[PDB]
Amino acid sequence: SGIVPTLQNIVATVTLGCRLDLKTVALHARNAEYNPKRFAAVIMRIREPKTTALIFASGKMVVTGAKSEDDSKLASRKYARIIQKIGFAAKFTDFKIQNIVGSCDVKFPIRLEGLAFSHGTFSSYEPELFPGLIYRMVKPKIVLLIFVSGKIVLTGAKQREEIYQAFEAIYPVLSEFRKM
Amino acid sequence: PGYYELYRRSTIGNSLVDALDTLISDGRIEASLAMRVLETFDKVVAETLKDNTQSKLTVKGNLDTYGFCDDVWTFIVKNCQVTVEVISVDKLRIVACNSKK
């Protein structure tokens, strides 16, 4: 294909192994918002790497927004370090990436309804609901959002390799339905 | 069944606390009476700012820190432009409460 999808977002979970007083975290950490009435967790953001963590009373958290596996682990470590610095027996445990999202640009337009009619068992296209075509790939198990513009969204991957393999697999069919 | 107390941290509210404390130290009033004045103050400020305020200013700058706890927003804006009715400000702390119950 000659193109390599760009990783745009990585979601990871981390068990800090120790109960937390969310009310206290929200009070001593900067850039933290806590509104239990709507979500039972403290939302905290940091600038390097630019990410957002969801911290729970159970001591477990979700780190989002990271653009690489390293930034994800690194950011996760900083959040844990803050929880500690606040006064908890937090530890960096069970780090695990749960989802990777990537995007592409094949540069050419795509006749989506032709692609949907051709691959009916994998794609759901109804512009009324959503402008992009939803392609549910089997191997690897990656969901793609194909747009008329040639823009491609790939998600559902746990290894960055799946995004790459998903894109290579779809390129031929994308090319086949190129508007030209 | 009351009003926010953040306004007691303002220039006029802090001055009232000062005046109130001198009368307490002079033994001219009881602390309870002072507290009751402060609680009336909270109401009066909320009503005066709501009915006798016309100005509309705007702040533009870099959000250094934000925070949201207990239905309160706190923001520290650095290197910003405050325009009233234009003012350059190195740092500005903003503490705000919900307009709703």
UniProtKB/Swiss-Prot annotation, chain A:
Compartments where found = Nucleus
A molecular-function term among this protein's GO annotations:
disordered domain specific binding
Q: Which UniProt keywords apply?
A: DNA-binding, Nucleus, Repeat, Transcription
Q: Where are the sequence repeats?
A: 7-83, 97-174
Chief location bin:
nucleus
Q: Which GO terms describe its cellular component?
A: nucleoplasm; nucleus; protein-containing complex; transcription factor TFIIA complex; transcription factor TFIID complex; transcription factor TFIIIB complex; transcription regulator complex
Report which superkingdom the organism of origin falls in.
Answer: Eukaryota
Q: Signal peptide span per the entry?
A: none
Question: What does the entry give for GO biological process?
Answer: DNA-templated transcription initiation; negative regulation of DNA-templated transcription; nucleolar large rRNA transcription by RNA polymerase I; positive regulation of transcription by RNA polymerase II; regulation of transcription by RNA polymerase III; RNA polymerase I preinitiation complex assembly; RNA polymerase II preinitiation complex assembly; RNA polymerase III preinitiation complex assembly
What family does the Swiss-Prot or TrEMBL record give for this protein?
Answer: Belongs to the TBP family.
Q: State the oligomer form and interacting partners.
A: Binds DNA as monomer. The 1.2 MDa TFIID complex is composed of TATA binding protein (TBP) and the 14 TBP-associated factors. One copy of each TAF1, TAF2, TAF3, TAF7, TAF8, TAF11, TAF13, two copies of each TAF4, TAF5, TAF6, TAF9, TAF10, TAF12, and three copies of TAF14. Interacts with TFC8.
The job of this chain, per UniProt, is described as: General transcription factor that functions at the core of the DNA-binding general transcription factor complex TFIID. Binding of TFIID to a promoter (with or without TATA element) is the initial step in preinitiation complex (PIC) formation. TFIID plays a key role in the regulation of gene expression by RNA polymerase II through different activities such as transcription activator interaction, core promoter recognition and selectivity, TFIIA and TFIIB interaction, chromatin modification (histone acetylation by TAF1), facilitation of DNA opening and initiation of transcription.
Tell me what this protein is called: TATA-box-binding protein
From Swiss-Prot, chain B:
A Gene Ontology cellular component where this protein is annotated is: cytoplasm
Residue ranges that the Swiss-Prot or TrEMBL entry lists as coiled coil: none
- The reply to whether Secreted figures as a keyword in the UniProt entry is no
Spell out the subcellular localization from the entry: Cytoplasm; Nucleus
InterPro entries found in the cross-reference section: TFIIA_a-hlx, TFIIA_b-brl, TFIIA_gsu, TFIIA_gsu_C, TFIIA_gsu_N
Gene3D superfamilies named among the record's database cross-references: Transcription factor IIA (TFIIA), beta-barrel domain (2.30.18.10), Transcription factor IIA gamma subunit, alpha-helical domain (1.10.287.190)
Q: Which GO terms describe its molecular function?
A: RNA polymerase II core promoter sequence-specific DNA binding; RNA polymerase II general transcription initiation factor activity; TBP-class protein binding
Is Membrane there in the keyword field?
no
Assigned protein family: Belongs to the TFIIA subunit 2 family.
Print the miscellaneous field: Present with 3910 molecules/cell in log phase SD medium.
Chain's role: TFIIA is a component of the transcription machinery of RNA polymerase II and plays an important role in transcriptional activation. TFIIA in a complex with TBP mediates transcriptional activity.
List the protein's name.
Transcription initiation factor IIA subunit 2
> Which organism's genome codes for this protein?
Saccharomyces cerevisiae (strain ATCC 204508 / S288c)
